[PDB]
Symmetry: C4
Subunit: 330 residues, 4 copies
Amino acid sequence: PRLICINDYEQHAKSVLPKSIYDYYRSGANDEETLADNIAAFSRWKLYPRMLRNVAETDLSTSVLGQRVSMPICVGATAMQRMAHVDGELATVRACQSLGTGMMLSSWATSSIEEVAEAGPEALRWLQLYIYKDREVTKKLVRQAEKMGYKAIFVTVDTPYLGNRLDDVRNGLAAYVAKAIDPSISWEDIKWLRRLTSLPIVAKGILRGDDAREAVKHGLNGILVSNHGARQLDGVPATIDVLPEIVEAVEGKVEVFLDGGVRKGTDVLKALALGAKAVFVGRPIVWGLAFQGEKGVQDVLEILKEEFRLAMALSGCQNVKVIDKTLVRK
Amino acid sequence: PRLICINDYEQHAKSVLPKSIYDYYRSGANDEETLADNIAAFSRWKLYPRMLRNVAETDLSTSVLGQRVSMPICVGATAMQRMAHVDGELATVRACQSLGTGMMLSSWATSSIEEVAEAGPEALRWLQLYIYKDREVTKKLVRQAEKMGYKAIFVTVDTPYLGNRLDDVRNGLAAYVAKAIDPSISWEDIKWLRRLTSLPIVAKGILRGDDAREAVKHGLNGILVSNHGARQLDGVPATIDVLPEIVEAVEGKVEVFLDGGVRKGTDVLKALALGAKAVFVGRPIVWGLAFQGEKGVQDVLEILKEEFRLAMALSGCQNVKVIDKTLVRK
Amino acid sequence: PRLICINDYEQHAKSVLPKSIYDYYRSGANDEETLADNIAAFSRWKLYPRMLRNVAETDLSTSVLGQRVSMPICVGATAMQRMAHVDGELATVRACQSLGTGMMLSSWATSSIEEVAEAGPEALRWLQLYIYKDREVTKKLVRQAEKMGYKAIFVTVDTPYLGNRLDDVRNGLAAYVAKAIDPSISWEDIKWLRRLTSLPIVAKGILRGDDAREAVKHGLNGILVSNHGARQLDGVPATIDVLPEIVEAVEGKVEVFLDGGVRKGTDVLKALALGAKAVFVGRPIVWGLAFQGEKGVQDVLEILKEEFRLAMALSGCQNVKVIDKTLVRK
Amino acid sequence: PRLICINDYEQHAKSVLPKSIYDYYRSGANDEETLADNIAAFSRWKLYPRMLRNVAETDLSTSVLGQRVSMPICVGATAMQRMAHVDGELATVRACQSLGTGMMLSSWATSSIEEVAEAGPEALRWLQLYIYKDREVTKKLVRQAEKMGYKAIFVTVDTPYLGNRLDDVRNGLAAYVAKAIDPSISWEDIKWLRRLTSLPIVAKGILRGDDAREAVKHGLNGILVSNHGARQLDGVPATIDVLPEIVEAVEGKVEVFLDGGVRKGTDVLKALALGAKAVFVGRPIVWGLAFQGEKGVQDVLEILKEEFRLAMALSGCQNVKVIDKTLVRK
Ligand SMILES: Cc1cc2nc3c(=O)[nH]c(=O)nc-3n(C[C@H](O)[C@H](O)[C@H](O)COP(=O)(O)O)c2cc1C
Ligand SMILES: Cc1cc2nc3c(=O)[nH]c(=O)nc-3n(C[C@H](O)[C@H](O)[C@H](O)COP(=O)(O)O)c2cc1C
Ligand SMILES: Cc1cc2nc3c(=O)[nH]c(=O)nc-3n(C[C@H](O)[C@H](O)[C@H](O)COP(=O)(O)O)c2cc1C
Ligand SMILES: Cc1cc2nc3c(=O)[nH]c(=O)nc-3n(C[C@H](O)[C@H](O)[C@H](O)COP(=O)(O)O)c2cc1C
Ligand SMILES: CCCOc1ncccc1CN(C)c1ccc2n[nH]c(C(=O)O)c2c1
Ligand SMILES: CCCOc1ncccc1CN(C)c1ccc2n[nH]c(C(=O)O)c2c1
Ligand SMILES: CCCOc1ncccc1CN(C)c1ccc2n[nH]c(C(=O)O)c2c1
Ligand SMILES: CCCOc1ncccc1CN(C)c1ccc2n[nH]c(C(=O)O)c2c1
């Protein structure tokens, strides 16, 4: 069928995936208050476009942690991509290479670090890391990322335990993940990881300014403002609503990124107006895989790219450097 | 059937137009957040009527850019009127002549500038203009408007590219329009147009006070606060909500007008209380054409006129000069 | 059937009245924004009950314009009561006599001033007045009210013209009323009426503090904060929301009353906490007549009385003198 | 069936109880505005979790009125437990003994004070008291609570009369309760009860800071911020919304508790962040009994315990002493 926006990709995925797999991907934690809010919050921020600026030649390119990208829209870590499409993470990395954007690989990816680097040798690639109770396997992942040309580590800090998604309980794996992830992870473990690698490290899952300041103090290189796609603690705010406090807190010392609820080009524009360098998408990528593997991911990323180009042009922004805080008001 | 308010005209149009044509007229951009808000915002502004003022002889007349009109309710530019009714823009201009109000003719009208002036020789007529990549045809339209007795140019400034209306993609023309409209349009092109004609020029599609001030600085003669009927950038505010900032910004130097969401006489009263000189209606006119051509447009304009008369009388306003800011609070 | 609250009476009335008659009674003006708000606004004001006050002997009695009543809940003027029940206004006045509360008789009542006084000789009775273009018949009504033992005039000031209720247009009388009511009514006509009678006069339909102050300056004896049951100008605020401004404006010089949306005993308590002396009910009385004439009106008034007694007791109020502004917050 | 959250227990109870019994348990007063708000209010308070704190060993234990409990989640008084399950209050007290939390026994319990103490000899048990018109039976209950090892009296102060639950009227007992409960109860009766027993006394049903201060002045030992599960006066605020004012008012002199709307572990966390020592649950316990008596109550309490453990861990709280006001914002 004819899919023209990200919601059409979700609707198609619901129509072709087994219910248990669609529910795993769609679900948030508990009553899904934050899942609704990640989307509703973007709608509350209103755009104040400038007219007559000359937007004939819109340039979406930017950089993430010193590496050039084609657009401020990157693929976030999502476990279990092979349940959406046989090609899983290799399909995703091939789409990212085509688009000129970066892929954050889950540390629970079915495809190995090496396999993804072999499928996307020229793709910008980052590794998402959990600090596992087994620090030997944690270290081995970081060293493999270094050796295979990955350009940053995104350490997930909001998952001492996995969240309670009610459909997953109504429909093994979760127990095996709980056995592996360390609930004792502290700032001392961040000091260890900062000593372990010279790669840029981003703290993924920060929601408070004081924690963002502590990440800067520990010599990390970025914050990804994230509520884990509303899958961890329900009743946290929308990421777009905490973004301004986090940008204020880090005083320009490190790049700030956002995920959670990005579905449209205007969502990207609002996040950049509030000070994010770039945004990451989770579920939209899975819906792309479910439609048509590599070509479906490419289509989702091209829809977001073109929606973002149009939103930039209609708001009077030739390039991402002129996106400013006066474009948005809540 | 018996149609007694503007929403009844829309419902009738949905019942008789081909789905693709109804959807073209009804649709807003993307998720249609602004389309809903243009209407909902009017409901948030509450009326504080004065009693016992003597409203036996209500006078709705006013002026637009120095020309007398019967009511502060005028017809906005809407392309493709011949898809609603065979008589298209000639039906509309004949209704405007009957009512004593003005018609803004789209520059993509099926009827020529001359043909409309021949159908409505005594009608107040304005030309809506896009600055086309072809500046020769742009100049020719302005000269034809001058020669055929049009009294102002409304230059549309919010359309460097056309918006993404999802139903139009689900259901050629849009490509031909994208080929013609210039995305490079800047304030330098406004200086060119201000030098090209002595007619009054109104900037249509301003949403920011700073842009309104720049339009005054370039010697334009009015601002039409407009989000293009919520068809361009989705997630901009409702026009009624940005109107007060724009009125404040221009410090009484030029007339300020409003379109977007006007469906009822109380909408007209709220816009005038917040400082608009007059309001324009888009979609209601198309629904009038779909019902009964000239007589349907006349009926829609008479419903709005009489709703407005009643709202003025119930709020204690004998004429538009006594409509003041204390009538409304958000 | 078993009707235990005012909404059950409405539901029963919808089930037994001809659609055109139910719609006439239920309807508000235009899109019915104020009709919804008159009810929703009461829900936004929250109650802060005091505990342990000794509410064994609750006393609901008060006074209206110097006359004792059994409860601060009185019957408002509603035209056309004989369309709900053959006994119409005689049923209503007999119920008011039983309850010990007052009845405001519409000046468009089917039963004459004399007939109502004959049915309810010991009932507290007031006359609602329109200043008719025919000042002779206006004067004759006031003199008949004086002669037949009525204790006040409620002059309706929000109806220069009748409102636009869409169902009445979809389903004669309205034209005959428009022919009779004077749209020229001004404060000069209030000076005339204040000279015409020594009875207490209440201005019914004031929504602004400045108009309330003008009513005090003209020697009127009360304000009834009213939007005519949301049937006149749509998009005015809820009466409960403007009540505090009007109470503030009159500085205790005259009694302030409220109608619009009273359906429950807690509505009565909120209006008294915000400074109203008493409240009036319109539609609930008509639903009572539709159920069972006099006995139905008596039942509606007894439900409101007992709901109000319970709300007073649960909030720690022994009598209406201890109802204070700290009981409510918006 | 597989019940994994408290709402699933309610849905199951609706499926197995007679409608009249389900409606008795579910219902709130009048239009049930407060019943909806007790739940909606928790959703408006947002959580600001701290990351990287080391939550490997979460400790939920606390104390209530000097007695250790396993978790800050206790069973509130609910009359008529034997209508949900044959074992009624004996099932409930056996579940509380298993969990290591306390049970507040209704003074209208079917099981006697002695019978409950015999079923749960090692359970933490409190008596909820009404001051009955018969002060002899009131005194006898307090003495029996003392003799049978109960550790506090919760005196209910928001019930001079029972509330108006509309389904109970649509579907005897209520008349017998109205005959027994004294509407004259004042602060003088609290002085009497404070002289009658040396047990800790908690005032249950306070919604105002000034009343909370008066309870402290009368030598009571705690406040239970309660609106009686929204069953008394409708249109009072949600308990979570008045909690902060009550905590502020008592200046740390006495413990403050909350009930009303607790359904999830994040509700418990929000109440403790705003200064409650512990929370009580009413309806969830009845749904547990309806499912499977003692084992159903145990399951409900274990679901709340584990939800609360997870919410504490995901918010960076090792124990209840580190739960602070910066975790929440409205
Ligand atoms: C199915 C699924 C699997 C995910 N797996 C991971 C993971 O393994 N590691 C991780 O750090 N984040 C994971 N996330 C969270 C995402 O990285 C990101 O925070 C979130 O998906 C963004 O929200 P969105 O889905 O609304 O874009 C996952 C999210 C989803 C929906
Ligand atoms: C079907 C349609 C066609 C339109 N065509 C034009 C156009 O050619 N030029 C223009 O400046 N505005 C155009 N507009 C925008 C209107 O001039 C106006 O901004 C808008 O219709 C007002 O909102 P309303 O439809 O809620 O009244 C169009 C709007 C619609 C709905
Ligand atoms: C059917 C109907 C007839 C009414 N007739 C009159 C009238 O003749 N004169 C008048 O002053 N107000 C009239 N009112 C307005 C009421 O006096 C009062 O303002 C309103 O009914 C109160 O709102 P409620 O219906 O929500 O209680 C009427 C209202 C209704 C619903
Ligand atoms: C069916 C039912 C019976 C109750 N019986 C009593 C009672 O006998 N005494 C009392 O003090 N509170 C009683 N309550 C109120 C509870 O103690 C508590 O305030 C309320 O249930 C908490 O709200 P929740 O049900 O949302 O948890 C009762 C509540 C319900 C729902
Ligand atoms: C149909 C697939 C069901 O896959 C699961 N079901 C239950 C639990 C875990 C998984 C998958 N795994 C291994 C992970 C691993 C790390 C993760 N980080 N975040 C998430 C998430 O889902 O939000 C993670 C999921
Ligand atoms: C059934 C008719 C489909 O007509 C189209 N369909 C798609 C694209 C364009 C058109 C019509 N044309 C030529 C224009 C021209 C200028 C415009 N300015 N604003 C609009 C608008 O629709 O908001 C414009 C539309
Ligand atoms: C089925 C009955 C239809 O009765 C009508 N139908 C239409 C118009 C008038 C009436 C009734 N009349 C005579 C009046 C007279 C004075 C009034 N003041 N307020 C109202 C009101 O309805 O709000 C009034 C109605
Ligand atoms: C199917 C059972 C219907 O039980 C009733 N029906 C109506 C009235 C009373 C009861 C039960 N009784 C004796 C009590 C006694 C004290 C109470 N305190 N609060 C409540 C409450 O329901 O909120 C109370 C109920």
